[PDB]
Amino acid sequence: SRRYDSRTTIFSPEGRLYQVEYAMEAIGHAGTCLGILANDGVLLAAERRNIHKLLDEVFFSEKIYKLNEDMACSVAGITSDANVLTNELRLIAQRYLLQYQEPIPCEQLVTALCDIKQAYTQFGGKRPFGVSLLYIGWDKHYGFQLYQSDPSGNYGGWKATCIGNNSAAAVSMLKQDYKEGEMTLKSALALAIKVLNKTMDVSKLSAEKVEIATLTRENGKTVIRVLKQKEVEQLIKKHEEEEAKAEREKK
Amino acid sequence: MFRNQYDNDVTVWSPQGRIHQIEYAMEAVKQGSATVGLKSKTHAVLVALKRAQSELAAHQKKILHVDNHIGISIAGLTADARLLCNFMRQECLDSRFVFDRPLPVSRLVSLIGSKTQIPTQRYGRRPYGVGLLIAGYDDMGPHIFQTCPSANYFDCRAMSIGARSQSARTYLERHMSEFMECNLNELVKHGLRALRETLPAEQDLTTKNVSIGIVGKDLEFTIYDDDDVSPFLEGLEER
Amino acid sequence: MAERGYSFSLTTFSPSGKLVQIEYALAAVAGGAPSVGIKAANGVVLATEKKQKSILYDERSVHKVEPITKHIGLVYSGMGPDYRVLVHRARKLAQQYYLVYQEPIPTAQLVQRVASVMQEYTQSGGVRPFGVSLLICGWNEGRPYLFQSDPSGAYFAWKATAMGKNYVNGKTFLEKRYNEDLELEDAIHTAILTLKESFEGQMTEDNIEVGICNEAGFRRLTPTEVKDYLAAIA
Amino acid sequence: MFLTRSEYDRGVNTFSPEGRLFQVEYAIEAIKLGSTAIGIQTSEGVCLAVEKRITSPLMEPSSIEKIVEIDAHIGCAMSGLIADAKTLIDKARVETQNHWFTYNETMTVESVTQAVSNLALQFGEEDADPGAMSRPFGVALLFGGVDEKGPQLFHMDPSGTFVQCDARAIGSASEGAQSSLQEVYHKSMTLKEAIKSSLIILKQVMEEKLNATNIELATVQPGQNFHMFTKEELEEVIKDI
Amino acid sequence: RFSPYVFNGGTILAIAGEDFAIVASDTRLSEGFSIHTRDSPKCYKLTDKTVIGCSGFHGDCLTLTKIIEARLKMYKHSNNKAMTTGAIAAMLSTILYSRRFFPYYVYNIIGGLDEEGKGAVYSFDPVGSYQRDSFKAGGSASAMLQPLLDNQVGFKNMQNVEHVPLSLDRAMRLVKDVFISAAERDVYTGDALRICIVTKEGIREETVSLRKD
Amino acid sequence: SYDRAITVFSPDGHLFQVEYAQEAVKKGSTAVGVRGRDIVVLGVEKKSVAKLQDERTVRKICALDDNVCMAFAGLTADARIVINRARVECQSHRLTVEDPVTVEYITRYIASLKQRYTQSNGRRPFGISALIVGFDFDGTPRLYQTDPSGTYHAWKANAIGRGAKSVREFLEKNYTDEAIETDDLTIKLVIKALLEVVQSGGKNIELAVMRRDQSLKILNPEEIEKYVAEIEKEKEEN
Amino acid sequence: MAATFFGEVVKAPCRAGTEDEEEEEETPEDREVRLQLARKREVRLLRRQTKTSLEVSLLEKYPCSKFIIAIGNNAVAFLSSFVMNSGVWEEVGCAKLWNEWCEAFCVFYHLKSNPSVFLCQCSCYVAEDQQYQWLEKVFGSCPRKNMQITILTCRHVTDYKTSESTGSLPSPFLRALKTQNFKDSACCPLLEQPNIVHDLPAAVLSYCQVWKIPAILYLCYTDVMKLDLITVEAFKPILSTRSLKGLVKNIPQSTEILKKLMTTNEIQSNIYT
Amino acid sequence: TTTLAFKFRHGVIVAADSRATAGAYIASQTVKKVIEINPYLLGTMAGGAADCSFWERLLARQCRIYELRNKERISVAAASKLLANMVYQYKGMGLSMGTMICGWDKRGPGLYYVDSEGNRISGATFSVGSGSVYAYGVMDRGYSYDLEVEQAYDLARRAIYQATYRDAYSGGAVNLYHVREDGWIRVSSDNVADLHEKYS
Amino acid sequence: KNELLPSHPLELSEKNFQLNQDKMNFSTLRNIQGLFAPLKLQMEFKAVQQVQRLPFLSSSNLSLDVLRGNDETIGFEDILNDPSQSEVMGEPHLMVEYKLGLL
């Protein structure tokens, strides 16, 4: 177009904000991030992307970010914008806790962050946040939830969605292999492993290319833990065994 | 040809060393209607050629009150004109509130000069495209001051600004000595003759299109319109 | 795809979704003096080269390797004045953290704050991103730390890395050389060798600047110590 | 010898080589895009007539309000951008009520028009931190009201100049309606004759059939305050003419 | 400490009539137990058809009169007409209530002809409340002057009396006598009596000498 | 140029950026709302029945107050911001005036907000058109429609979004007093209009019903399918 | 050249208008709307009398010997005041066009006594892309090379370029520009070398020069443009010379009164009083 | 100062005295203490006369703006709430305002008591002022919802007369008003001396 | 409102500490340097503050600190209350409009 895409506030003749679309393209450039909702709990399986041997992982979550005791999120986009957005998410959640002395519902936090992003997209002179976030959380109103945010400022509640690289293929695969109402945490992990294995065509998963975090409720407490490398290796081995068995059966 | 880049903005200096936005403001004030302002040894008279948008529409006023001893003649942009008139009225009120004396005309003109200079130096602001002929009476006597869209101001014994004002200026320059020493009625008739010189030969001055503002020694600034300017028109010589 | 208008502006996203000005700032970083940081088990070393144009340069006037606090130091590749401003900001942030919590600021938190400053400077339209990347070192909880803050504000924890000119070759050399349980006073040698790879000429005590951090704290090596290390490695 | 693409049309604070401010003229063009509104000033009152452009029958004709009540003795007919008209109407009403509060008397129609004009000239010149009128207003108003001087009719333009008019027409067919007014208007005409003439000119200048649904008429009289004609009265007038 | 207000004395009085509006006041400016000056009329003419009397703190009186003059000029410039007596009264009420928490220590009485040519007298308090009356007295001797005005002009407590319309000469004689009594019994009144008669022809100023302290 | 700056007037007198916001509104999904005797009903055509998505989080019909409803067509984030602002203003009005918010008042507030955002060229206009519908204090049904420019108009029946013209023609052809009299008649009219908008219909119908002195309630897909079956049976009878 | 916010990147406009083309250089909808605009902007030459669209060009339909063309309100006012009352002029054809920028009409007249003599009162503006279409519609493709074309138009003193400033210049002055074939006296000073004409008069004069048609262009520079009497007074020398000497009869008295009629019914500038 | 307001079947009756005293000295005996807000709304004056007048006039202009904008008359409750908000934003500033907002709206007759303290309460019978106790007693003994217009007028007149008789700061004349669906009317202004002659 | 009256005599002074310090610096410059220095510093501060995060996001104001000489100075203001940990944040659009002067 070479116009209507400079100030982040010009409407195209057809009514398009091309800067938001370019931000979404930047999201597409990011690594694969996947989240599946199940009755037992909701999980996030994200590609670690950076795999340089000399790189060190001093944090427990390379790209997973715990927002509060009842919530967690994953990132696919610009890293620094993601950091500031996660800080703002934590700030908003703690402000709600201070005001009402109760954990913030997931939808409220997602709406607040999306309002911030939409405000950034509305006023000229500010670069839109090129980050797409996937939220997993539990609340007393709707239980387990999975949400997806966009640079534009639009969110949505999904049962199984993926953002980042090869998002369309992952979404189609989830549509093919998701059983609404009968999906359990273990089957959810298996499906996530299968989707990650297909989407990332570099090679078979080695548990260092991916990062899986599961959200569950134990003894009336929300437990957010990141699966250890050994557990991811076992899941990958199980998926490989299933694939080999299916291939042998096909003959 | 090569001045397009330096023509758009007022903060951009042209290679020749001339800001074209100020010249365009001068053109804008030139595009307005014609006014004539002259002063005798005891009176200052402003005669203006009011213009009507249509036959049904009333003639738009061009002589505006400022103080008991100061008045202006309108030429150019009307909105900037009203802003300037409000500013001068506020300045005169402040002077009469603080020092309890009429504000000297020269000080008011200097204040207007500074105020209209401020926009020409800053970005995002345009020069005030209005020219004013200011008639007033002070301890020094009658005064006629010409304010240009460029902040610089002029002190004149007689001056005409607006469209087709060159003929009026020529007539005024022809009879300056008579202007200095003459009766109030003679001065008003001279101003009317200059305004007529501005008008085409076929056209003639009428009570509807003539507005007169007079300030003198014992006379405050009074604006005459229609039946009030009829006495001055009566007795005027044929062109 | 010239995309010239997209490249001129910072806030303007490219059609592909790339912030071109950030890539230009990264290129500015890559055009700076080489700097090498190695995180050994005993400690972490920050070695860089201070290319002095002429011998009439007071070595004590300026320092590429500067301390932030009693246990955190950093080195840079790119623009000097930006590095100095960022050093002042990092020192202020560390002192604010100490005042608030009465505890030495962990290296990770300081890196996050500096990255937040970088992000703030690259977000709003009207300024340019800091054309400098900081290799920040520290020692917290009996553990060495090495971080690299990019102009965009993305910070990564490294075990060994190099920036500036010939940084890809330096990283390859570190990959060949760096060892898991390597200790200090040997990672210094590895960094010196990496600089040799990235240096054009002979390296003297004044041509390079080395700063180490260990349990005791961050300390910029004196020219005499650099000379003895250079003699030992050659 | 070579042509140049010299542009002076974009900036509101940019003068043309002849001194013309083109943004104001384009606001006037926006006025020309509006519906025709006719106002006639007589000795027995004022007559404001405007045409409702009803896109579809579903839309409520009463919702398309173009003649409003500034004060009991002041009415206004708009033509151009509707929202700008709403802001100007709110300003005029607030100014009239402030005048009544301060001086315990009705505000002159001239004073109300002058205040609205003072609001309608702050494009790049307000010098106020609060968000002002960045672009010139795209509506022209006909402040028709009766005061102690008698019936009055003032026309406000996007530039900000208010001129007293005996009979003014503004809108898409402004020139033709103005010509018809000048051909038919005389000083000693009655209010009923003015209403009939305005209705006839309107019927002439609109492409739609004249009916009470797609027209709006209001009159302000020395005796009676601002009165909005009902559907029955409108039908009676259409039948008469 | 610092006291922003002091009482400078002064007594004002306005009488309304069929075609006249008398506004009378004394010329005694006295602060504390001393007399600042013996020539300081408390009545200032605003327009041809309005005269206002100000009593109390002299500085506030001067400031209020100057503000009123400035507002009259502003109104003339804006509405292109001279402000009416009722309009002046309403504007003065608004101005007085503007400085409600730092009230003007001024007793204001506006007297002049209305649009019908009838005498209109508006009495004000320091806060700003006002109403239209046929006669009023303000200042130090307001309590002393009011009863006789009620008895004579109002014909109150007068059984079997003729309610003769108030003539100009009778009003002037009544004003002179009431101010003579005030000078007799009030220490803040005396020296001279400035009488401003507002009629359709104009404003006439009359000075009557009162007994000095 | 003229079409890039919101404040710049085109030579004809157009503010082309407002018209481009209107185009963005047209790009949105169809929203239809009619008015009836003591019954106001809204209907929004879902663009697609996206599987693995919670329909609750992507609803287009919301309640500004207990007596006012609203449906939008355009950018979702702008609609959410406008809805939050409208709810805040409704509560502020119920606080300061103590009376229930009139549909006219909230429609005016939304139009004023949109016009303010159209004012400056730094801020882009809200690219949404809203169908504010509800009951006043006296219980009179009211339907209103706002535009990005800031102009609000009352309608007996309106349609916004993609295919708005065809649905508006349908409503104009099939709007009768008898249909308004019966609440079921109005609901069936909205179903017919939306089915004309989208051939598939069925699950894609997002309909909400508000009646006199009753809060907004959205019919479940069961009731929507029942009404669709009623319409189909009526069509078959003919 | 937006500068909407602090860091907005502004670009210097090109006097050659290159940037417009650079952006310009498809989708079927875009092509359809572009063609709709093209057909909306095209000149449609027709006649209101009998409503007969003039597919055939005016020159082809009627041979012409003297075509006087007036562009601008003042020029058409001068022609209306002077030539109409001298004889009889009935309307034959009228070009209808729509432009971004805008009694705007282009009406053609022809003398009953001598049909060869024609007229054109173009009171409307014609866009840069429509002058050639107008020439094709009126003159067609085949010229006659035997017409005395006197183009009349008005410009602003600011347009004129000279060492003297615009204010110092005598406002009611006019210049001339004639083709090679036009050997008649111009009766006016020739236009200065740097001064260019870039409107419909320029299009007509260029067409005449290329096809060897004797034509003369008159430009009356004036400070005012809204129905000014001095402008037509300065035009009078045009009828004082040949060509328009016979078309206008020896009745200046009626024309002078008629000219006052046009000026009396004029609209003043609300912005500038 | 004594004001009387009660809402009976046929509307709202508003009565007040006309005595304004600056301390012991009686400043005036003809002050109109019934402020007419709108043709359908009206208020009273108790306490600070200037404060009451200024704030009631501000409320009147606000109500006129509301009518112009919404094209509908403002309800009594809305006007009372607006006045309460305006006087509450200036709480603790020494304002002494006491008034009763009497009007007729879609709900019916309306009577709200608003004071500078902040509380706003609706009720059938109200009375605010120095002599409000005496009028309260008389009205309570003589009040009834099923009352004729003449009976209500007499009750209000007698209550105000007794309040003036027992209160030193109350006197002058009884400004009796009646609020009806078509608008308020001024019934009579009876001098206290005449009432004393009549009853006694 | 009573909020205008300070609760503490030191509150009014310390609430505008930065503004008062800038005013004192400008006064000293005007007294010694002249009109150019205060105007130059005002323009620099305006330019630096014009570019920052939106109101609902905490800004660093690094250039402003460098220009004001506070880049290496820490007071109670910087440590006692953290603007990042606001604990009270309004609507983003509401805050932006408030800053722009609409509200």
Tokens of H9: 């079947």
Chains E and G touching, counted as 3 or more CB pairs less than 8 Å apart:
no
Length of chain D: 241
Total domains present in chain F: 1
CB G107 within 8 A of CB G97: no
Nearest C-alpha in G relative to B55: G265
Q: Do G272 and B164 touch (CB under 8 A)?
A: no
DSSP assigned state of C125? B
Spell out the domain ranges in chain H: 1-200
D139 and D34 in contact (C-beta within 8 Å)? yes
Calculate ∠ Cα I27-I28-I29, nearest 5°: 90
Check if the beta carbon of residue D125 is closer than 8 Å to that of residue B125: yes
Contact C148, C132 (CB under 8 A): no
Show the domain range for B77: 4-237
Residues spanned by the domain of E139: 1-213
Helices (H), chain A: 18-29, 79-100, 106-122, 167-176, 185-199, 229-250
CB I85 within 8 A of CB A91: yes
State the DSSP code for E57.
-
Q: Output DSSP code: residue C175.
A: H
User: How far, in Å, CA of B170 to CA of A85, rounded?
Assistant: 73
Q: What is the DSSP letter of B54?
A: S
- The answer to whether residues G101 and G182 touch, using CB atoms and an 8 Å cutoff, is no
Helix (H) or strand (E) holding F119: helix F103-119
* Set of chain C residues whose Cβ sits within 8 Å of the Cβ of A56: 39, 146, 157-159
Contacts (Cβ under 8 Å, ≥6 apart) of G168: none
Task: Identify which of F28, F48, F71 has the alpha carbon closest to the alpha carbon of residue F163.
Answer: F28
Please name the amino acid found at residue G250: N
The type of residue at F131 is L
Q: Which amino acid is at A73?
A: C
CATH classification of the domain holding E112? 3.60.20.10
CA distance C124 to chain G (A): 8
**Torsion angle (degrees, nearest 10) of CA B64, B65, B69, B70:** -40
CB of E197 closer than 8 Å to CB of E189: no
H49 in a known ligand binding site: yes
- Rounded distance between C-alpha atoms, residue E19 and residue B150, angstroms: 55
Determine whether the interchain pair B54/D11 forms a contact, defined as Cβ–Cβ distance below 8 Å.
no
Q: Which chains have at least 3 CB atom pairs separated by less than 8 Å from chain E?
A: B, D, H
Please say whether the dihedral angle defined by the alpha carbons of residues E152, E154, E157 and E159, taken in this order, is positive or negative.
positive
- Angle made by CA atoms C142, C144, C146, in degrees to the nearest 5: 155
Bridge partners (DSSP) of residue B158 are B38
For H15, the 3-state DSSP assignment is strand
> How many domains does chain E contain in total?
1
- Say if residues C211 and C218 touch (Cβ distance below 8 Å): yes
Q: Say whether B187 sits in a helix, a strand or coil.
A: helix
CATH class of this structure's domain C4-233: alpha beta
Using alpha carbons only, give the angle G233, B173, B129 rounded to the nearest 5 degrees.
70
CA distance I92 to chain F (A): 10
Give catalytic status of residue H1 as yes or no: yes
End-to-end CA distance of chain A: 52
DSSP-assigned beta bridge partners for residue I96: none
**What is the torsional sign of CA D130, D135, D136, D138?**
negative
* Cβ E162 vs Cβ E142: under 8 Å: no
Q: Are D45 and D219 a contacting pair, CB within 8 Å?
A: yes
What are the φ and ψ backbone dihedral angles of E194, each rounded to 5 degrees?
Answer: -90, 120
D215 token code pair: 């027209």
For the beta carbon of residue I75, count every other beta carbon within 10 angstroms. 10
Q: What is the largest CA-CA distance in chain F?
A: 58
Query: Is residue A67 a contact partner of residue A112, using CB atoms and an 8 Å limit?
Result: no
Of the candidates D91, D47, D70, D86, which has an alpha carbon nearest to the alpha carbon of residue D216? D47
- E runs forming strands in chain C: 35-39, 44-49, 66-67, 73-78, 132-140, 143-149, 155-158, 160-163, 208-213, 218-220
Structure tokens at H18: 């006309």
Domains observed in chain A = 1-248 (3.60.20.10)
I66–C127 CB contact, under 8 Å: no
Q: Kindly list the domain boundaries of chain C, sorted by start residue.
A: 4-233
**Domain of residue F197, residue span:** 1-238
C-alpha dihedral (F47, F51, F56, F57), degrees to nearest 10: -80
Cα–Cα distance measured from residue H63 to residue H85, given in angstroms and rounded to the nearest whole number: 14
G266: alpha, beta or left? (left if phi > 0; alpha if psi -120 to 50): beta
According to CATH, what is the number of the domain H1-200?
Answer: 3.60.20.10
Residue C223 parent element (H or E): helix C223-232
Select the residue of A2, A3, A124 nearest G4 (Cβ to Cβ). Answer: A124
DSSP string, C112-123: HHHHHHHHHHHH
Distance CA A3, CA A22 (A): 13
D166 touches D179 (CB < 8 A): no
A136 membership: H or E segment, kind and range: strand A131-139
**Residue closest to B78 by CA, chosen among B26, B145, B130:** B130
- Bridge partners of H121? H113
DSSP A197-226: HHH--SSS--SSSEEEEEEEEETTEEEEEE
What residues pair up with G152 in beta bridges, in sequence order? G70, G218
CB pairs under 8 A between C and G: 18
Q: How many CA atoms lie within 13 A of E37 on its CB side?
A: 6
Residue of E nearest to D105 (CA): E87
Q: Which residues contact D97 (CB under 8 A, 6 or more apart)?
A: D71, H61, H64, H65, H68
Residue C219: HSE in the Cβ half-sphere, 13 Å Cα cutoff = 10
Q: How far is it, in rounded angstroms, from Cα F56 to Cα C153?
A: 37
Interchain contact C/G (3 or more Cβ pairs less than 8 Å): yes
Strand partners, G67: G118, G149
Inspect the interface and report whether the beta carbons of B89 and E66 lie closer than 8 Å. Answer: no
Residue C206 · residue C223 · CB < 8 Å: yes
Phi, psi of G230 (to 5 degrees): -60, -30
Spatial contact of E118 and E200, defined as CB atoms under 8 Å apart: no
Closest residue to D18, CB basis, from B27, B83, B126: B27
Q: Which amino acid is residue F207, in one-letter code?
A: L
Technique employed here was cryo-EM
SS3 percent helix, strand, coil of chain H, rounded to 5, is 35, 30, 30
Cβ neighbors of H127 (< 8 A, separation 6 or more) are H2, H3, H4, H5, H135, H136, H139, H159
Contact G95, G137 (CB under 8 A): yes
Whether residues B25 and D182 touch (CB distance < 8 A) is answered with no
Tracing tokens 């009838």 back to the chain, one arrives at E118
Residues of chain D found within 8 Å of residue I100, distances taken between Cβ atoms:
131
Length of chain F: 238
CATH assignment of the domain containing B213? 3.60.20.10
**Residue A51, Cβ density class (10 Å: 0-12 exposed, 13-18 middle, ≥19 buried):** exposed
Pairing of strands A42-47, H185-191: unpaired
By CA distance, what is D181's nearest residue in B? B56
Size of interface H-I (CB pairs under 8 A): 4
CA H20 to chain centroid: 15
Classify each residue of A108-138 as buried b or exposed e, where b means 16 or more C-beta atoms within 10 Å of its C-beta: ebbbbbbbbbbbbbbbbbbbbbbbbbbbbbb
The helix/strand/coil state of G224 is coil
Q: Are B120 and B19 in contact (CB under 8 A)?
A: yes
Angle between helices C80-101 and C107-123 (to 10 degrees): 130
Q: If we measure between CA atoms, which residue out of B74, B80, B79, B72 comes closest to residue B61?
A: B74
User: Domains along chain D?
Assistant: 9-241 (3.60.20.10)
**CA–CA distances in Å: residue E134 to residues E131, E165, H174:** 10, 12, 20
**Residues forming beta bridges with residue H185, ordered by sequence position:** H178
List, in sequence order, every beta strand (DSSP E) within G4-125: 44-47, 52-53, 66-71, 89-96, 106-111, 117-122
Q: Which structure tokens are listed for G133?
A: 């279409």
Q: Flag if E78 and D103 touch (Cβ within 8 Å).
A: no
The one-letter code for the residue type at B223 is I
Rounded-to-integer distance, Cα I85 and Cα C112, Å: 16
Instruction: Enumerate residues 6+ apart whose C-beta is below 8 A from C57.
Output: none
Which DSSP symbol is given to F57? G
d(CA C183, CA C179): 9
One-letter amino acid at D104 equals N
Nearest CA in chain D to E87: D103
Return the bridge partners of C84, or none: none
Could you give the angle at the alpha carbon of G233 between the alpha carbons of G227 and G238, nearest 5°?
110
Give the type of residue at G120.
Answer: C
Domains in chain B: how many in total? 1
DSSP class of F123: B
* Cα gap H65→H72, rounded to integer Å: 10
Q: Residue holding tokens 């100009």?
A: E168
